[PDB]
Amino acid sequence: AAAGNIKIVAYPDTNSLLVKGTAEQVHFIEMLVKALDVAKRHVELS
Amino acid sequence: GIATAIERLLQGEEQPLGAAAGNIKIVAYPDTNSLLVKGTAEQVHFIEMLVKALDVAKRHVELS
Amino acid sequence: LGRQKIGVMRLNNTFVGDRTYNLRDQKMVIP
Amino acid sequence: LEEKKQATVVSRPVLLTQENVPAIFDNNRTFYTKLIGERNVALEHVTYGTMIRVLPRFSADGQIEMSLDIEDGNDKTPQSDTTTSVDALPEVGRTLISTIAR
């Protein structure tokens, strides 16, 4: 369909996203999320 | 809670969910801690499979 | 036509939702 | 005069919660004052004390990431012999920390 009928709702109770769309748009957001989800490093400032 | 997150997910939503995705009504019933879903026989089974994935037991953290 | 589908994606290394802090009078919100 | 001094203080708050649930521990003190106005007469108050607000979350490896908001305040006292010890002057000193650790 279109890019304007995708609904994204935060569910903080299990720390997860809820995406509603077609079977090709759900796989499209799942590949974007795994690129924005990386582990961070610690900085101590003195 | 869980009854406000799925209610905003199905808001508007003129989409062919299997009628439409916009005529599903979800109402919280706190007196027995359960959801009330009204739709066709295929949309009710569609929300029942989503609820069993968001319903997991939690672990305890003690912070000192 | 395409059937609708709901996916649940758990995040392991970040937080959903905004973070809020203060500098003595004013509130800052990070998306 | 010849003076020596030493002072140690170790304080520890403990709080229990679940995953992805915000929790609050608070141990404060309230100071009420009488603002003698005529129209919008009110009891104004200040508040100071220990306070933690945490949001724990388990990572994929078994580590615990937290979103912290720590406040530790107490009441600083000026000289008791002067008149400003009887009015509404509790000089408050606080210590605020807001960060994220894992």
From Swiss-Prot, chain B:
Organism of origin = Salmonella typhimurium (strain LT2 / SGSC1412 / ATCC 700720)
Q: What is the annotated quaternary arrangement, including any partners?
A: The core secretion machinery of the T3SS is composed of approximately 20 different proteins, including cytoplasmic components, a base, an export apparatus and a needle. This subunit is part of the base, which anchors the injectisome in the bacterial cell envelope. Forms a stable homooligomeric complex. The complex is composed of 15 subunits.
Which protein family is it in?
Belongs to the bacterial secretin family. T3SS SctC subfamily.
Task: Tell me the disulfide pairings in this chain.
Answer: none
Upon gene disruption, the observed phenotype is: Insertion mutants are hypoinvasive in the HEp-2 cell assay.
Main function: Component of the type III secretion system (T3SS), also called injectisome, which is used to inject bacterial effector proteins into eukaryotic host cells. Forms a ring-shaped multimeric structure with an apparent central pore in the outer membrane.
Instruction: State the organism's lineage.
Output: Bacteria, Pseudomonadati, Pseudomonadota, Gammaproteobacteria, Enterobacterales
Q: Could you identify this protein by its name?
A: SPI-1 type 3 secretion system secretin
* Gene this chain is encoded by: sctC1
Localisation? Cell outer membrane
Q: Which domain of life is it from?
A: Bacteria
UniProtKB/Swiss-Prot annotation, chain D:
Q: What happens when the gene is disrupted?
A: Insertion mutants are hypoinvasive in the HEp-2 cell assay.
What subcellular compartments does it reside in? Cell outer membrane
Protein origin, superkingdom:
Bacteria
Family membership noted in the UniProt record: Belongs to the bacterial secretin family. T3SS SctC subfamily.
**What do we know about how this protein assembles, alone or with others?**
The core secretion machinery of the T3SS is composed of approximately 20 different proteins, including cytoplasmic components, a base, an export apparatus and a needle. This subunit is part of the base, which anchors the injectisome in the bacterial cell envelope. Forms a stable homooligomeric complex. The complex is composed of 15 subunits.
Q: What is its biological role?
A: Component of the type III secretion system (T3SS), also called injectisome, which is used to inject bacterial effector proteins into eukaryotic host cells. Forms a ring-shaped multimeric structure with an apparent central pore in the outer membrane.
| Annotated protein name in UniProt | SPI-1 type 3 secretion system secretin
Instruction: Tell me which species this is from.
Output: Salmonella typhimurium (strain LT2 / SGSC1412 / ATCC 700720)
* Portion of the full sequence shown: 359 to 460 of 562
